[PDB]
Amino acid sequence: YISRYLTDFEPIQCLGRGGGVVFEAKNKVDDCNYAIKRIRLPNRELAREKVMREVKALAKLEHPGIVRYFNAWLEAPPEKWKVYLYIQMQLCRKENLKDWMNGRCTIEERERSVCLHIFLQIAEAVEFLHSKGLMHRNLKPSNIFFTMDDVVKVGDFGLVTATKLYMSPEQIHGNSYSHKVDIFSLGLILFELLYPFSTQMERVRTLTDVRNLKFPPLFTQKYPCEYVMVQDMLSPSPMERPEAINIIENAVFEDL
Ligand SMILES: Cc1nc(N)c2c(-c3ccc(NC(=O)[C@H](O)c4cccc(F)c4)cc3C)cn(C)c2n1
Numbered sequence: 476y477i478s479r480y481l482t483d484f485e486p487i488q489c490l491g492r493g494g495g496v497v498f499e500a501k502n503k504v505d506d507c508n509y510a511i512k513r514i515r516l517p518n519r520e521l522a523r524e525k526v527m528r529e530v531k532a533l534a535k536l537e538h539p540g541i542v543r544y545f546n547a548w549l550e551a552p553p554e555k556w557k558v559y560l561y562i563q564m565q566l567c568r569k570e571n572l573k574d575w576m577n578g579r580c581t582i583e584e585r586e587r588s589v590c591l592h593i594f595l596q597i598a599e600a601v602e603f604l605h606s607k608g609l610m611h612r613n614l615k616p617s618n619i620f621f622t623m624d625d626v627v628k629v630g631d632f633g634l635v636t637a638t639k640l641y642m643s644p645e646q647i648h649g650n651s652y653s654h655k656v657d658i659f660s661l662g663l664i665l666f667e668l669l670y671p672f673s674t675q676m677e678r679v680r681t682l683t684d685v686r687n688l689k690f691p692p693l694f695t696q697k698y699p700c701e702y703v704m705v706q707d708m709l710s711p712s713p714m715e716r717p718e719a720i721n722i723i724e725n726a727v728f729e730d731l
Pocket residue numbers: 490491497510511512530533534535536537541542543544562564565566567568569620629630631632633634
């Protein structure tokens with residue numbers, strides 16, 4: 476009849492394709508642009524109560540590696556011919572980690588100091604979520620962001636409502652059983668951060684190999700201690716993989 480989203484915000488564009496939709500909308504009152512995730516909630520009533528308990532425990536979250544929350548509200552519009560859950564989140568930089576990485580193809584432009592710094596933020600963000608008994612399960616360059624303050628942000632996660640390149644095996648076939656799946660994703664990210672790429676062909680080919688622990692020799696030589704971690708993080712038996720804390724507490728994560 477009269478939508479909360481339509482009255483309070485004037486849309487700019489769309490950003491994300493749902494697995495729900497994500498718009499860039501200016502709040503008219505405070506005249507700031509935000510990322511607004513629109514979700515179609517489950518018609519099953521008891522599945523809904525679970526989703527709400529999550530937004531309740533999600534709103535609580537506050538961490539520098541986590542995107543800033545603002546407001547969450549519901550809309551039950553008239554069937555044009557269903558209830559939506561809108562979520563207002565801090566709008567991040569148009570250049571995400573994927574965009575950033577595909578702008579820097581030289582092993583120089585991937586300076587060791589900058590890459591370890593970036594990854595640590597991603598690692599710390601997961602430590603936090605893991606400490607709260609939460610798992611991200613959407614870790615990939617396409618869904619890692621920078622603020623207008625150049626601070627790294629682990630992207631959209633949670634509120635599942637029931638590329639697989641960074642997904643762990645058990646995540647691709649199974650129920651994504653353990654939080655370890657995030658550790659695995661971190662592994663491939665750290666690699667791709669350190670090891671540049673020329674083509675999508677190379678990216679896919681090399682990463683598909685690195686998934687099965689086939690590392691370019693140039694890498695293993697140049698970065699030996701990181702290679703130890705990336706192995707540990709990719710360890711094919713999840714239980715073998717380090718906890719988010721163990722990664723942050725490493726010799727490499729110092730001298731900065
Ligand atoms: C430019 C930009 N900025 C963003 N913030 C985004 C996002 C985005 C990133 C993160 C989330 N949500 C979250 O991180 C969590 O779901 C969450 C929810 C409530 C409270 C929390 F503390 C955390 C939701 C979007 C749309 C997705 N896309 C494509 C974006 N694009």
